[PDB]
Amino acid sequence: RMLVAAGKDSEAAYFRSMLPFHMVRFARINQIINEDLHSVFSLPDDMFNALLPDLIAGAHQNADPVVLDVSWISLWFAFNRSFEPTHRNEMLEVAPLIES
Amino acid sequence: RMLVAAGKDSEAAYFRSMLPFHMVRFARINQIINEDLHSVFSLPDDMFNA
Amino acid sequence: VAITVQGAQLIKRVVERFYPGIAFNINEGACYIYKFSDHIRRIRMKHGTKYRRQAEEIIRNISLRKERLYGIPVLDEVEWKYVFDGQTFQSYAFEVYVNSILPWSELDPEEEFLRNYRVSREMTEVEKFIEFRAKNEMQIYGDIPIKVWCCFINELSAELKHVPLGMQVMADFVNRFDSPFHQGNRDLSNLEDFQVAYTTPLLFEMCCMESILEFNIKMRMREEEISALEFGDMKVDPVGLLREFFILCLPHPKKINNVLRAPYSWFVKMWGVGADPIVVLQSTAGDDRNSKDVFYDKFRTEPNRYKALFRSSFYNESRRMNEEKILEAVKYSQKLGSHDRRLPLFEKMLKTVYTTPFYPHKSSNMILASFLLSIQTITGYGRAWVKNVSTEFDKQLKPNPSNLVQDVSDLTREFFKQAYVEAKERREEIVKPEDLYTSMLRLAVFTDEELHKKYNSVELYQTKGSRDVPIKATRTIYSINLSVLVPQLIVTLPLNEYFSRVGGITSPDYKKIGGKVIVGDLEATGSRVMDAADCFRNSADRDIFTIAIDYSEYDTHLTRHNFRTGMLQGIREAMAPYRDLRYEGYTLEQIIDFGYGEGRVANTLWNGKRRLFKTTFDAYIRLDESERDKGSFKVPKGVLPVSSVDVANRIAVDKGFDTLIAATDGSDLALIDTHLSGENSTLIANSMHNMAIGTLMQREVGREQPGVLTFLSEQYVGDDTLFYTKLHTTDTKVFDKVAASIFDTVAKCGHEASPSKTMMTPYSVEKTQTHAKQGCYVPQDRMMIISSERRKDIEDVQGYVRSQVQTMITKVSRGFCHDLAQLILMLKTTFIGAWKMKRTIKEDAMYRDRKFDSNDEDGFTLIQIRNPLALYVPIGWNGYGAHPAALNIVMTEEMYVDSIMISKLDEIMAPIRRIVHDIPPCWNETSFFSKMARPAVQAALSDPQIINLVEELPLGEFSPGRISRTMMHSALLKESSARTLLSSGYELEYQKALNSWITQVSMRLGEESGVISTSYAKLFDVYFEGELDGAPHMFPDQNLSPQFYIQKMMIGPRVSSRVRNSYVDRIDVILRKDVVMRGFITANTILNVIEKLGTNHSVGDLVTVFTLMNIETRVAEELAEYMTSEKIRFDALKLLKKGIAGDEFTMSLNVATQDFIDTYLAYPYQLTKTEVDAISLYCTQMIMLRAALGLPKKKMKIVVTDDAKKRYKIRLQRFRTHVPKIKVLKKLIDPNRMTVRNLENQFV
Amino acid sequence: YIAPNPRISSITLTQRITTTGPFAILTGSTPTAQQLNDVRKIYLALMFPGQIILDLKIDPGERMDPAVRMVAGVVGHLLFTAGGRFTNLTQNMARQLDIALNDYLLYMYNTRVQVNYGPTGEPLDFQIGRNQYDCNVFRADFATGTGYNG
Amino acid sequence: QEVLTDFRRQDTIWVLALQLPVNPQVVWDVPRSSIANLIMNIATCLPTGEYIAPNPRISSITLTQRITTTGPFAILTGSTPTAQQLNDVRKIYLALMFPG
Amino acid sequence: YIAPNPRISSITLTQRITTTGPFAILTGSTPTAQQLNDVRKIYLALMFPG
Amino acid sequence: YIAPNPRISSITLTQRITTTGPFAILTGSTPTAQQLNDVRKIYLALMFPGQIILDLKIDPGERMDPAVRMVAGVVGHLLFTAGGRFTNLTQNMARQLDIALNDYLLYMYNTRVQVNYGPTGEPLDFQIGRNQYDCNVFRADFATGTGYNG
Amino acid sequence: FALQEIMQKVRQVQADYM
Amino acid sequence: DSGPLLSVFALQEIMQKVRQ
Amino acid sequence: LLSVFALQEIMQKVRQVQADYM
Amino acid sequence: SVFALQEIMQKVRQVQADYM
């Protein structure tokens, strides 16, 4: 509604046609988080809820998140590349014996 | 504002994007005058204002 | 008066002297005769088939010439007694030569071989060794036999009424001695005889060059209409400067010229530096000292600030070392020759060299300064025996507190570390393990045992190489095994590409490192006057004091370990961000010492030419009875072998020195720890060693004598440094102490820079053999026309002399005479393909290949003597073209229809008009990979064969790839057999393609549909109208002929970048970068793939079409955007065919740039972007011809009238060169392009 | 990593020739081997949501390039999350994606799309268009997450 | 100040032939010396530098965005300066550093 | 006889391609010999007015 | 002399994903043999607190990166001591560190934060930041030691 | 439609190898 | 001072009008 | 695909027209 | 005998003498 109102008509009709592609990319990440990265090495529910209010307040008594550095043009390439997990990891079934 | 009243849209959408390049040119001339060309051979203030 | 009428009489007269019984007509394209020798007649005698008349036919055609076969006359080559008409002279130089000869008493290891006497029926152990050396050392291979060169000067000296001394010492060589050698005219590489002396071809090559050098001067002296040259006050004769020089070398010319070239080069640098009024050419450019965008003003004079500075002790010590270097070369030749006279004209100039002035605006000081640079090129291509010497690291300087060795080694660690970081910002990184095998094609292997094997053994080793140089002695080249050079390929790759760019800012207080070092390419991209403009403007400036030191024997002091460890310390610590990924199992820190290990560069055995001693014979057989072994290592053909050095050194010295000796196996030849020239980091490393030394130069000057000698620029190239400084005091004592601290820094690093080589001068600059003096350009020309580097095979004679005229454009650009550069090519246009035919013919009938008869099996091959005016008939009509009035203008077929319509060319091109469409045609000849190939290639090679074959037999363009790999497999057997085997095939083709040749009328000015040439401008007229300023532009390069001085006067030197490089060549820049794309495919290759398909249905069907070329996948991006750009931007779809404006004098001028159109061009606006280039490339040749004639400078304007019939012929002919009729059904291109839709509405 | 169909940009992002822009320049490019490694870092920060946040690179040349900088702001609001429960952007990165969108919305406007600025003079503080769309919500506020996927 | 800071400094006698706070009126009392102080100020303090063009995409997206239309501004961007017009640019920036 | 500057029509008269008119044909289009003698007859009539 | 543990800067995630430090260029440098004799002066001035005092050694022969001065205006303010009891450094050496801190805090290569200068012209007389931290307390005051240790 | 099918055959058997 | 250079189509007109 | 003929002896007529134009 | 034009070789001294 902003790109239409700002006169960018030919550039707003690119994001409307990309909307089925944009949904299945974020619908694939929600399987990698929810049922593939689920171990004892995932963050507990009370440490996770304090990650954002300790980043705003600047209270470093918790842990600091890892900061990666990306370029500017890879913001555009990441919109046009969708991660599709072909090969799952060869330690997933050996995971609960390693963690025990 | 004058260059879009007259209808020159593409010629006045060029000076807007050249605005950060413009203001860092004149923010380097403001250093060469104020803290490099500052000698006793610079012009005194009462000779400058006239 | 024209070159085409007067010069063609001379080259005809050379053939009238060479083959003496030849009736020659100029209006015939090419006359044909034949001749034979009985070296092949004796061979089939030995196979059993005897011949009828052995030498009876030879008696028939010696002087009576009364026999001729098939009507074709049979004429013999001239003997050596008659090439100078039997003339004789006094020739005091010749009697100096004959007493400077000595038999059987030479040192068998020596650099440049001396005068050996040939005595017949002598031994086969010394004389076969001397014949072995002269067969390798003294070779005059090239394109022209040396015999007709000696006849050419005999015809040329008569017309100018001037006798050269090179012919005077040659004319005495013909009356007492019969024949110097027997050079076969078919191959030019065989010299199988020496009659009185072994150095007879060096006697002629230094004489056939000596004659042209004073014909060049004496012709040029009348063009400047001055009698003689003028040193700053007194008159000086230039020919006496060369005759005093030619006598001194003539004892031992390769050794004398190598040690006398140093005071001759030093004299021209320091000439006009000490005079008090100094005339400069005032220049103006950017604030950086290396800026190339220069603007020139008029001449002016200024008072010298450094007048009292040359009273110092630095110059007074440096001058007596150069006056010694004159005298040691003299004393070596005062005794070996009988002469008691030497150099009397030059010695009077060196005593007062600084204070005498030099003014460039007068021609009588610019010819003389150019001549002394061009003196040293008589004994060209110094081919020298080199010996195999070891490291001898007891002389290697150990790091010390009192020495700067450790401080140099810790400086250079921080420079390889800095070059890796600043290449990361330019996206130059290390290569990955993924593309490790793909990136191995950059050179033309990898096994875990082959990578762990060493080379410091007698069994397996490395083997050296050697290649020649123009004037210098033969420098070595190192050949490294390709197994351990790929570990150097993976880690030196972001340094080869990073220093490949041309632009850079050279400031000492700048933090960056890439601008201050630079490694150029093989050929000088651009001109030499154009890209060395930063050297000109700093000799015109009153406040720049330049310092340029020189390292004598740089590798002997690069041999030290301090640059070996400190480089490898910076390699390891900068691979620390790449420490996780493994190269084929093992880490990156393990593989860097596989390309820089112990058995890789630290201690390796190398095999060159062997050590050898000259001993007796009786004591040899008493010891050789126990050690007669061979088979381990080979021995030269003159030398007698033994086993070990330890049995070869006990018998070493003899007063008789009869027989030679050589140790095969027990030698332990050479072990070297020095930066090799063959590695991927040759020019990167040693230029960084100058950077680590040169940064220590500025520190000690700033810490012992502070406040003086501030540094403003730092240029580091191969074996050279160049500091652009300014000096803050004109003192005799203080400058003597600053100049002393510079040498104490180099000597405490380990090197020994000579005070005679070091340059500390205000108004002179030399940088990479480009001499800049007082704001102008003093040129040298070490390029030569007789000898060559290697033997040259004329495979594309259309393209050879088209390439040879490029190296004659440069010669006249350095001051060679323009018309003498025309006579050389008019001589060199008849004597190229004279001996490239197999079997004889009968005229006006079929061409006999097989004979099977005793008569015509004696007359083996034919002779083809082309007309001397085949130089001027334009290309495309089976003959290469260069214009007679100016050498830089390419004669094309649209220029032939223009040059006859001009009234000032009706006299020059009168005999040209009768030989067009008369000339005969041109000899125009034309397992591992499953790993080292891109996945575009591996998927296409591992295909099902039912799918892989349909790209091969039925369809597919496929210019590179597997068949080009087979062509790459044909390129590696190319050097001996595949060149020879197809040479048996093209000759059977060329006889059919000559017999089917009909000289066709109705020349055409046009091209095909999908391309266009410079001949497109002949659709319209052209009206010379308007008027421009007649202001003579100023330019630094003086010393030009009036055919070239007037082109630079009316049209100035260029000030911007040329725009005529079209967007078809803008994608060549993308294909120039990749060396897997540079040597294989280009714009004419890549546009034919666009010719197979344009206007597809998706860009995803677009990126993939050049993976079908099977070379790369990254640069399909640049072919994705630019085809999308040409789908957006207008283009004329066609290509541009040209051969013009490429020589290095045209790039200097202000033609073919965007500022050339705005004054000299007026074209209709209905023209596309590659059509205005075809007008402009036509417009460049018109104005350059308008200036080189003396025609008035006007504004060229192409006109389109209102004649409604002539408006129809243009719309009919512009249409067919844009869109093809039949080929639209082949390409299936759409016609709904915007550009081709305007053609309905353009001119109407 | 799967690209979209090339007939998605070709029928609506470059539907007319004879007009270029910030999107039409960027769409004719494919990334280098050192930029695939940055897309490989985006899809590591999105999978560990609060644990791995990311930030923009220092280097010039791209920070001065107004075609890369304008198309990255419009994309970067649809892709990331500065929401009210977790975050993928840093405090600094979501500020640079606001100056970037502020440039794209008004680098070219005729007298059809009127712009009415607000009092503060911050990025994205105007009302654009005939329907007067309030563009203040696309300024990043980490307490509520008003411009991004949360 | 490395001269005042050795271990001998307690009992030295510093002489100083020239005082530093120069009374600048004595340089400007020389009659009609207003051009001689301008050349002496240029040669003593003026820095030497490089001239930097902006991105070529900063005018491609906005000044030549319509092909099949040429104007006054759209002509000049496809033009390179000669070496004698850079010297007039070097006179623009000399007048900007000395205002009146 | 002095022609005007060829940039004075290229920014206004042929300022966009793919649109022609009566004026866009006549530009360029140099005069012939007999059509230039007619230009001399224009100016001889302008100097002597009646 | 023990160097710190190298995993403090870089944390390697997968194979090719590695966090990088802000002083990536300075940590991967080596001291030359002249500068190593200057590190042995600093620890010789820390062990003998009042008796050995440091200075600056202006040298025209050596040419450094301009960023190594501004980084070493931070390190000097949290390594030395100019407190109320002893000093490790001269009244001049502690003056060129406050200028080196004044230049490091104002050369901002990210988005600029606001700043409000004071009435004098002294170094560090402003209020940098969004919440306006008073930077006046880092000028050297040899009677209380407001900037350095102590 | 020969050359249109040449690319479609190779671009399918390029995918099953990579 | 050499005069203008004609096109090919101006040269075709002279070659036809010398034969008629 | 245009072509002139090799036989043109109109070198007086092509000299006359540019002398008439001059 | 010289093959260069005498009209060219006289234009050069008209500017070779202007340097002097």
Short mmCIF file of N, CA and C in Angstrom, two decimals, chain C residues 1 3 6 222-225 361-362 819 904 1034 1042 1188 1190, chain K residues 1-4 7-13 15-16 19-20:
data_model
loop_
_atom_site.label_atom_id
_atom_site.label_comp_id
_atom_site.label_asym_id
_atom_site.label_seq_id
_atom_site.Cartn_x
_atom_site.Cartn_y
_atom_site.Cartn_z
N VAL C 1 59.68 12.27 -58.70
CA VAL C 1 60.05 12.79 -57.40
C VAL C 1 59.36 11.96 -56.33
N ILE C 3 57.97 8.63 -54.21
CA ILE C 3 58.56 7.41 -53.69
C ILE C 3 58.14 6.21 -54.52
N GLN C 6 60.43 6.76 -58.06
CA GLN C 6 61.87 6.72 -57.90
C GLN C 6 62.32 5.51 -57.10
N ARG C 222 69.33 16.60 -44.38
CA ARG C 222 68.80 17.49 -45.39
C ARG C 222 67.34 17.83 -45.15
N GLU C 223 66.61 16.96 -44.45
CA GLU C 223 65.24 17.27 -44.07
C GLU C 223 65.18 18.40 -43.06
N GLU C 224 66.20 18.52 -42.21
CA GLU C 224 66.32 19.66 -41.32
C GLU C 224 67.14 20.79 -41.93
N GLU C 225 67.60 20.60 -43.17
CA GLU C 225 68.39 21.51 -44.00
C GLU C 225 69.55 22.15 -43.23
N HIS C 361 64.75 22.93 -28.82
CA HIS C 361 63.97 23.58 -29.87
C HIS C 361 64.72 23.64 -31.19
N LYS C 362 66.05 23.65 -31.14
CA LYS C 362 66.84 23.49 -32.35
C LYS C 362 66.96 22.01 -32.66
N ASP C 819 61.01 8.10 -45.67
CA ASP C 819 61.12 7.49 -46.99
C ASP C 819 62.13 6.36 -47.00
N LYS C 904 46.66 16.25 -55.75
CA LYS C 904 48.03 16.18 -55.25
C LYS C 904 48.56 14.75 -55.19
N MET C 1034 51.72 22.38 -29.57
CA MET C 1034 53.03 22.07 -29.01
C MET C 1034 53.03 20.64 -28.49
N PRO C 1042 59.25 15.19 -41.69
CA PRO C 1042 58.17 16.11 -42.06
C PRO C 1042 56.87 15.44 -42.48
N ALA C 1188 49.05 15.63 -43.86
CA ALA C 1188 50.31 15.12 -44.40
C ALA C 1188 50.51 15.46 -45.86
N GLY C 1190 49.77 18.96 -46.87
CA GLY C 1190 49.82 20.40 -46.96
C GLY C 1190 48.52 21.03 -47.38
N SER K 1 68.58 14.32 -53.62
CA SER K 1 67.15 14.35 -53.91
C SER K 1 66.34 13.98 -52.67
N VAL K 2 65.29 14.74 -52.41
CA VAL K 2 64.42 14.53 -51.25
C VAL K 2 63.05 14.12 -51.75
N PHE K 3 62.45 13.13 -51.09
CA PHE K 3 61.11 12.69 -51.43
C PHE K 3 60.02 13.43 -50.66
N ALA K 4 60.39 14.26 -49.69
CA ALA K 4 59.39 15.04 -48.97
C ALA K 4 58.96 16.24 -49.80
N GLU K 7 56.43 22.04 -49.83
CA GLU K 7 55.42 22.84 -49.15
C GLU K 7 55.30 22.45 -47.69
N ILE K 8 55.47 21.16 -47.39
CA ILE K 8 55.50 20.71 -46.00
C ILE K 8 56.76 21.20 -45.31
N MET K 9 57.91 21.04 -45.97
CA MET K 9 59.20 21.39 -45.39
C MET K 9 59.42 22.89 -45.27
N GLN K 10 58.54 23.72 -45.80
CA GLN K 10 58.59 25.15 -45.53
C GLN K 10 57.63 25.58 -44.44
N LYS K 11 56.59 24.79 -44.16
CA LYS K 11 55.72 25.10 -43.04
C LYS K 11 56.41 24.81 -41.71
N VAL K 12 57.41 23.92 -41.72
CA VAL K 12 58.05 23.52 -40.48
C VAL K 12 58.98 24.62 -39.97
N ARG K 13 59.76 25.24 -40.86
CA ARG K 13 60.62 26.33 -40.41
C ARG K 13 59.85 27.60 -40.10
N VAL K 15 57.46 27.48 -38.07
CA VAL K 15 57.28 27.29 -36.64
C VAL K 15 58.52 26.75 -35.95
N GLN K 16 59.54 26.32 -36.69
CA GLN K 16 60.82 26.03 -36.05
C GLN K 16 61.56 27.31 -35.72
N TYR K 19 60.06 29.01 -32.39
CA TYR K 19 60.62 28.58 -31.12
C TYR K 19 61.85 29.40 -30.77
N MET K 20 62.66 29.73 -31.78
CA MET K 20 63.92 30.41 -31.53
C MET K 20 63.72 31.86 -31.12
#
